[PDB]
Amino acid sequence: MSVTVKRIIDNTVIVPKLPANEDPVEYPADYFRKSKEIPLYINTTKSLSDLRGYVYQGLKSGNVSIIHVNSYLYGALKDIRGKLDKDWSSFGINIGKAGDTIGIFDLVSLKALDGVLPDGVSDASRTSADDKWLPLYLLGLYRVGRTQMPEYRKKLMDGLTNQCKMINEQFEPLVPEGRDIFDVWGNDSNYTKIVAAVDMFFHMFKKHECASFRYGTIVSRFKDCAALATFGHLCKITGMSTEDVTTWILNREVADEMVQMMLPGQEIDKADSYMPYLIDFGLSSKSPYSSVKNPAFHFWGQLTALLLRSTRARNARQPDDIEYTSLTTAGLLYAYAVGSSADLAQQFCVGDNKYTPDDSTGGLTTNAPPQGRDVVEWLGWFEDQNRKPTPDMMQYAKRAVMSLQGLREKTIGKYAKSEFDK
Amino acid sequence: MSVTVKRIIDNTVIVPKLPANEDPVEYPADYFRKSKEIPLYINTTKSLSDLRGYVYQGLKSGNVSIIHVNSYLYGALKDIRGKLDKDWSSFGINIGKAGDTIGIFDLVSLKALDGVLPDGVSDASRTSADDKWLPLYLLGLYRVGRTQMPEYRKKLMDGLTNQCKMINEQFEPLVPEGRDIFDVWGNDSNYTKIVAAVDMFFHMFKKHECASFRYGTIVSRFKDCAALATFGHLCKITGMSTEDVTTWILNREVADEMVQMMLPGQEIDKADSYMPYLIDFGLSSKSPYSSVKNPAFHFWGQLTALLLRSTRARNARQPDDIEYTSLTTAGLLYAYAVGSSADLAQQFCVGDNKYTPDDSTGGLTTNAPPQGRDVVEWLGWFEDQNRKPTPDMMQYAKRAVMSLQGLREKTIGKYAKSEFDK
Amino acid sequence: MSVTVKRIIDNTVIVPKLPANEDPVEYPADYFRKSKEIPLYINTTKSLSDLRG
Amino acid sequence: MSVTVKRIIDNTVIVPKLPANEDPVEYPADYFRKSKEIPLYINTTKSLSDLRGYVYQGLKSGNVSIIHVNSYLYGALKDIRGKLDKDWSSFGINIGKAGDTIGIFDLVSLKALDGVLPDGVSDASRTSADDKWLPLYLLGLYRVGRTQMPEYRKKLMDGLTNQCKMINEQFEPLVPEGRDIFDVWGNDSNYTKIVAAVDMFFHMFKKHECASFRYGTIVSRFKDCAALATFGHLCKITGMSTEDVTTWILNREVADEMVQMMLPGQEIDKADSYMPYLIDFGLSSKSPYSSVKNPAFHFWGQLTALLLRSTRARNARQPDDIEYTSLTTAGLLYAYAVGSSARDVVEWLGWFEDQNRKPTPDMMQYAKRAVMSLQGLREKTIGKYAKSEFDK
Amino acid sequence: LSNDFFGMEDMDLYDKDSLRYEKFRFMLKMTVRSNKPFRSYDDVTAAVSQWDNSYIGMVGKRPFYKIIALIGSSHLQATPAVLADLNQPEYYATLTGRCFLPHRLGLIPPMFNVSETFRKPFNIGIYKGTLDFTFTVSDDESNEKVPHVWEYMNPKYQSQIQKEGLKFGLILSKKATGTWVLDQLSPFK
RNA sequence: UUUUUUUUUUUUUUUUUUUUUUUUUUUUUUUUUUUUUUUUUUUUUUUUUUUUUUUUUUUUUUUUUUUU
């Protein structure tokens, strides 16, 4: 317990604690300490051609089984090709050694699924034209069946069809117009493991001949990690370094989210690691890096980036059941600091010519912005205003939020236009 | 007793004690000290197909027996599948150990029901496609039979129908439009034990292929724990640390309510524990976290959250036979403290740049809001305002309660609009 | 690591790090230290006339 | 004790004595009187190529064993070459005699380690290109791991990589960027003995072909001897003689620290001796010349050098829990005497007593001039303390 | 042994195998899942004998846990699911009571009233599946006379307890009176 | 007035830094310059909830309708 609370009628302790309304965070490091592999359960007791017929006729009839599609995806993606150049160690697992050819499924442990295999709709007229487009379509269905919105789903389906025609160019659509059965595919653990493994393998091998499979599996990259996405967007939209941005966090609730966000043993800064797929691989059942688990930090980052005129921070969904006043005030303060006082400081010197004129009327104390990016200077300036937003700050917010046509409901843009456009 | 009580005509004691109008609280820890297992009485002297026919024809005819449905639910939910990654010890009960597969009923002790088995309406034309969707429907009726009002029960039934149709795709509805029988199923103890065990098992294994069964049993999670849920909601809406919130509670009944609410040996902070099912498993006949046993804190927290513009705290039923003046004043004081005076303090620093200017005319004694979040300082301001809330607090309440169209009768929103909107 | 950030509630560091949304840079010198050649994979089991046709 | 202390209720003696919270100083002369050699325990039951592969793959995988690296360092540093010219006797040990070839480990006694040898991950495809750059890297990862600060560690790693790349020119970095395992190497005793022996051998033979090994092992020279280093810095930055500066010290704690520092039988004024490695060779577990066993004199000398405009005396950290006012007064007196009088001690003491022991405003102005305009002072150091107290 | 090295004289408390009686009450729960029904009780012993392939449980009760596993395998009654074709055959057996086991395993440490579950899949070739256990072996200081432990197996099964009881790793012998005394477990186990 | 004994709603003991791996302390360095709610069956108290989510962001690489 951080501190102690006394019941003052007799000086007794009560040690208050939150209820378990939401599951606690789980980190991939703990999972990989528990087990040293990622099990992938599949039923490989069928020929590749028979499995391809199964999946083709199931997609055409809209009654394909997840076990059949998983087994076929394993069977058609055994491309050991792809030669590493550097070591690919991650989370204490030796994926490869800088030169040995590696397959897609060499980075996840493979087991045998224990269950009953469905009968199937086996066909024999399908030739060996599977690897060209069928795994691509099957993986694209995974990304398509996550939008839950007709317009975006239709756009994604059209993009997937175009990508498949890029390689096959005949491609009569397989799944019927209705009867969306690929929605359930995301629930299955093995399918998510397969799609995440494919995504990471083709992210390591960008220039592979089958890199087109990255379509429909890119959603697995950094899945359920909107907090890190918004933190990177904030760090890139302000120009301010992360090591100095992290000092600007306030409201004392962003603090806990930031602290649980940056535990050392996660290597969240390593691209070729298991961190982006902490939930699809099953490493973490509850992703600590999500937006629901980190609502305050997500809201603050999106609002701040919106007040800095960023095209991304206008559609992020505004979280619920969080204090909005303090977060809005902190975001407005940081955004005004970024967009009002450009740093504009000498960086590199040729031997000499480094300093600044301090004796040339260095007036500092006045009713003006501190003309810098130090957090305490702005904090002192704001306290000199007795903790209320000056009308210049509100005018800056209004100019940064006005002309935001086509806003989206429940998003940060609509909330800012309702709040910072009085 | 607290201390002695003397009536001064003869210097005699009265030692008053409250009548047992309402049953005293019961904690899960006491039950688990009394017994080291959770018995489940079922009648297993029947085949799975016969029980499936029994329950199918009973649901179709609207006269299914509770023993038959309990036995069939046991028979169809013997899925030992689900591999634990970590230990699942709870209340000194070793459910599993970091790698051993466990079933739904591996976490509840199983016995033999002592009674006569009803005859049944046995059918033989129903194949073994039951585990996919029939336990889902049977558990969904449990949640459906708690609304007690058609305009919500219809939506719940439609959701259950969609949930089952996503699996079976035919699903002609079984229970007739009227003639409910699933209302009584809540009274039975074994049915509640089974449904809560299913809920907790599928909560531990979220990514299970049969995780859809969580529909209809999610209501068992934190059942009759409205006080704990509203405490968590209050701690999440105010943004203040969960331990500083309990320092703010007043009125002398909320304190004792809190003390009985969080006795240390109850394990209310662990998600994968037996605590959220203290009443469905039979661990406690009267849940101390209920709203009927904890009216004052529920009312005060819901009112505070409503004053903080929370969409959740607008439908909670206003408790009866409690004070509506002291609690309302305390909630208004808390809301004005948190929603007006944002903390907004420096959190992270790089070596230096920590403090605040205390020599820049840091006056304190003024007729202004304290501009802080400490309970003692706001309390000092309030008592300097002779415990009569200022009209600015009324204006804040009016702004936070107005525009709340479509309120619900007997709920917190209606009372707030009738009280804080004079 | 340039400078350290410490949390003023308990005097604890946090070592913040940016996410790898964009892949890190790779330099040609690093590759040429890794390998001393540029492999070009082709299939030469065909005559020039056949391939041009 | 010095003189008796009596309790006047019955005229009884108590002989007060300080508790031994900090271990008493140990001197190299005492150790060399106890034993006439410096043992070095290694496991030589492996081929040189096998040990080379062991250490190479351990560094690459970041799971190397200290026994294997010590054994390989012994195997690859048997360069008996290097011809002496003058007698190299030290602490009554005949290391060499004016014209005999000498090796690195010739100056330390060698024994056989008693223990179990780890497995090893040997790679058999490594040629005999080890002695050129690998021992240098292994010795440099001791100094690199002795920093415990990211910026200094990064700079030292860059310098070590530059030094190594001068020899082989390929040098793919071996230790992984994360999980630094070489910090533990300093804990072991035999590794420190080897690194100190290498440092002293290449300090005597400056113009050796393999003199580049001095990188990383230079930190072993005068290790935990900051008090003697700051005494030399004070003697050099003032131009005043060492026999005359010792009279100026005051406060009666600096006097005791000098007394314990200046034992005659320590030969602390000999460069080619075992003294600078009194703690790496294991001669003394608690060096009397350290800055923690001699905090008062270290603080006083650092402050005095700072007030005399020395760039060195602005990063030494302030010693903890020692009386500062008297030390600061003595340091200010010495600094003003040096900076205003281009030096007798009793004359300045009488001059100060004419002020009944209170610094004059002129001395505070001199200190202000000597401490003003010190940009980028790092925390807890003498510069920060002087800027806080002498720059009012 | 003494023929090999110097100075391994035995203690004077128990000479080599001083026989002693250890009265103890117990409780047992069992659940054996398999792909096919067990044709013979010998296959049951084969499938249960590896219940402690990776042993985490008690040491002072390990022989007692083995004998309780034997008694549970003896009384492994079937279930309605074991019929022609319903599902995988699931077996069940539970026993509770008190008994005393004559054994020559030396003095046993004092046992406590603590329960330990056991789970382990078995692979005896033709038959797949897992197990389940819940022992409650603990001391009984009451003078109340208890039935002989080996009596808890009905004579209907176990035509030769000398080997049916040895399938689990035990080594049996006869006290020349009709009471079986436990010599020791499997050697070095 | 009192049953006798009592007299910290004082106490397990030992403690007394939210001090401590040791060694350190130039974020110096290769070397060399009968009663009386016309109350209640019980449990209830978001006409909240499948889970995971939070851009109608994303094939990778691109960022002069620049170039032999």
UniProtKB/Swiss-Prot annotation, chain C:
Superkingdom, natural source: Viruses
Disulfide bonds: none
Location(s) in or outside the cell: Virion; Host cytoplasm
Similarity remark: Belongs to the vesiculovirus nucleocapsid protein family.
Summary of subunit composition and partner proteins: Homomultimerizes to form the nucleocapsid. Binds to viral genomic RNA; this interaction contributes to the virion assembly. N in the nucleocapsid interacts (via C-terminus) with the P protein (via C-terminus); this interaction allows to package the L polymerase in the virion and positions the polymerase on the template, since P acts as a bridge between N and L. N(0) interacts with the P protein; this interaction prevents the uncontrolled aggregation of N(0). Interacts with the matrix protein (inner layer); this interaction contributes to the virion assembly. Interacts with the L polymerase.
Role according to the record: Encapsidates the genome in a ratio of one N per nine ribonucleotides, protecting it from nucleases. The encapsidated genomic RNA is termed the NC and serves as template for transcription and replication. The nucleocapsid is bullet-shaped with the tip containing 8 turns of a conical spiral before reaching the helical cylindrical trunk. Nucleocapsid assembly is concomitant with replication, therefore viral replication depends on the intracellular concentration of free N, termed N(0). All replicative products are resistant to nucleases.
Protein name per Swiss-Prot or TrEMBL: Nucleoprotein
Gene: N
Portion of the full-length sequence here: 1 to 53 of 422
